[PDB]
Amino acid sequence: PSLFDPIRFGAFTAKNRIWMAPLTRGRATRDHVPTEIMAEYYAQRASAGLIISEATGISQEGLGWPYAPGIWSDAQVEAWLPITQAVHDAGGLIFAQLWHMGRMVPSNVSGMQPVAPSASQAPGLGHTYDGKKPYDVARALRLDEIPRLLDDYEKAARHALKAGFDGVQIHAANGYLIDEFIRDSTNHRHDEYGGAVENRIRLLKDVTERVIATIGKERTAVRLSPNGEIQGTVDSHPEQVFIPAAKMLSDLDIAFLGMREGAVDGTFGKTDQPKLSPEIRKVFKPPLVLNQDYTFETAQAALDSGVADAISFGRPFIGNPDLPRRFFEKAPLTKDVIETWYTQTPKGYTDYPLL
């Protein structure tokens, strides 16, 4: 397959195999309501086969990123309409990334204590509405709270359809809530959601089954990050836990699995925990979309091997609205301005020229 060849996935055909990775940009409101400028931003990049949205909070409890959007309220759904409309006018497809940040939710943002599989304090400093602050002490989510959490995911997934998204991708990477349950450095639970591999993927499983029951498998995607430590989340033997995860996901027949894979020389994830896509390819039958550090040449190499069906691009899409065109034209890629990744205005957001 050619990077430029269409791909069938779920209920859809993407126009190409050059996809937009989920990118948190912070151009929504303090109260996590999307804004008009986000529509232009996404429209510019509609040549992406699929745009995966920036991470979108499923509830205030799960949303701790300042000026990131949520999707739990009616006013949020309404504000998303112009964004999805724009994408579909430009002929493109967009999935919503559904986001529970777990232990990484700053109380300055959510207003409450963050929840996690297990009690702990995330290392580091979180972005807030008054500067960086260190993270709070999370509480271990009670077994009797999992029914609620699932309803939070259900509401969010239906709200995504109302907002005009083609479907959802469940954020289960990068050290946020689901990924904390999966990995043995963060999951120290004694009940049916911790200890054994099947217990550790149990939240992933039930949240996936609840989304599938709400909006159909053909609109339901998952993100994982099985290799390399991130935000104090790592597993001691990731092959033991992520391969069974990938097989459980494949049996549900989700629309695609996206994964960000760290590398020894990785620039958004550095690690010698090796990449598990080769082993995950063998158990995961639906489309497998690989990410992190791909060039045009390495992305097509991955397609040529069959290990990837598509590749998402992150920072390249930030400064290169029309990446696919720049690829085939052999046009230099504009470099993204790191300082403006997460500021609040149009500068370094919608002001990168197209070709």
Ligand X SMILES: Cc1cc2nc3c(=O)[nH]c(=O)nc-3n(C[C@H](O)[C@H](O)[C@H](O)COP(=O)(O)O)c2cc1C
Ligand Y SMILES: NC(=O)c1cccnc1
| CA 38/CA 47 separation, integer angstroms | 16
| Kind of pairing between the strands at 51-57 and 137-140 | unpaired
Among residues 150, 268, 325, 334, which is the contact residue for ligand X, using CB under 6 A? Answer: 268
In the numeric block, the tokens 């009797």 are attached to 144
Amino acid identity at 315: R
Q: Is 16 annotated as a binding residue?
A: no
| CA 5/CA 87 separation, integer angstroms | 20
Among residues 40, 229, 239, 293, which is the contact residue for ligand X, using CB under 6 A? Answer: 293
- Our finding on whether 55 is near ligand Y (CB under 6 A) is yes
Phi, psi of 119, rounded to the nearest 5 degrees? -70, 135
Report in angstroms how near the CB of residue 195 gets to ligand X at its nearest.
27
Q: Which residue, 89 or 351, has its beta carbon nearer to ligand X?
A: 351
Q: Which residue, 85 or 107, has its beta carbon nearer to Na ion?
A: 85
Do residues 7 and 13 make contact, with C-beta atoms less than 8 angstroms apart? Answer: yes
**Contact stretch for Na ion (CB under 5 A) within 11-19, 86-94, 132-140, 205-213:** 86-94
- Our finding on whether 53 is near ligand Y (CB under 6 A) is no
Contacts of ligand X in 41-100 (CB under 6 A): 54-55, 97
Among residues 7, 21, 122, 140, which is the contact residue for ligand X, using CB under 6 A? Answer: 21
Total of chain residues touching Na ion, rule CB under 5 A: 4
Q: Which residue, 13 or 267, has its beta carbon nearer to ligand Y?
A: 267
Q: Which residue, 212 or 323, has its beta carbon nearer to ligand X?
A: 323
- Our finding on whether 126 is near Na ion (CB under 5 A) is no
Structure tokens at 329: 């034209």
- Our finding on whether 85 is near Na ion (CB under 5 A) is yes
Amino acid identity at 266: G
176 is annotated as an active-site residue: yes
Report in angstroms how near the CB of residue 303 gets to ligand X at its nearest.
15
- Our finding on whether 44 is near ligand Y (CB under 6 A) is no
Q: Which residues contact 151 (CB under 8 A, 6 or more apart)?
A: none
Report in angstroms how near the CB of residue 80 gets to ligand Y at its nearest.
18
- Our finding on whether 71 is near ligand Y (CB under 6 A) is no
CB count within 10 Å of CB 145 equals 13
Strands (E), the chain: 7-9, 12-14, 18-20, 51-57, 94-99, 115-116, 120-121, 125-126, 133-134, 137-140, 167-171, 220-224, 256-260, 288-291, 310-313
Q: Is 123 annotated as a binding residue?
A: no
- Our finding on whether 139 is near Na ion (CB under 5 A) is no
Output the CA angle 81-87-90, nearest 5 degrees: 135
CB count within 10 Å of CB 199 equals 16
Q: Considering the candidates 42, 176, 294, 349, report the single residue annotated as catalytic.
A: 176
- Our finding on whether 164 is near Na ion (CB under 5 A) is yes
Q: Which residue, 140 or 245, has its beta carbon nearer to ligand X?
A: 245
Round the CA-based radius of gyration of the chain to a whole number and report it. Answer: 19
CB count within 10 Å of CB 256 equals 27
- Our finding on whether 88 is near Na ion (CB under 5 A) is yes
Closest chain position to ligand X (CB): 314
Output the CA angle 143-65-274, nearest 5 degrees: 75
Among residues 118, 174, 227, 340, which is the contact residue for ligand Y, using CB under 6 A? Answer: 174
Q: In terms of Cα–Cα distance, which of 44, 45, 42 is closest to 18?
A: 45
Q: Which residue, 10 or 316, has its beta carbon nearer to ligand X?
A: 316
- Catalytic (active-site) positions: 176
Residues that bind Na ion (CB under 5 A): 84-85, 88, 164
Binding residues for FMN, as ranges, are 22, 24, 55, 97, 223, 291, 293, 314-315
Residues that bind ligand X (CB under 6 A): 21-24, 54-55, 97, 171, 173-174, 223, 260, 268, 291-293, 313-316, 341
Residues that bind ligand Y (CB under 6 A): 24, 55, 173-174
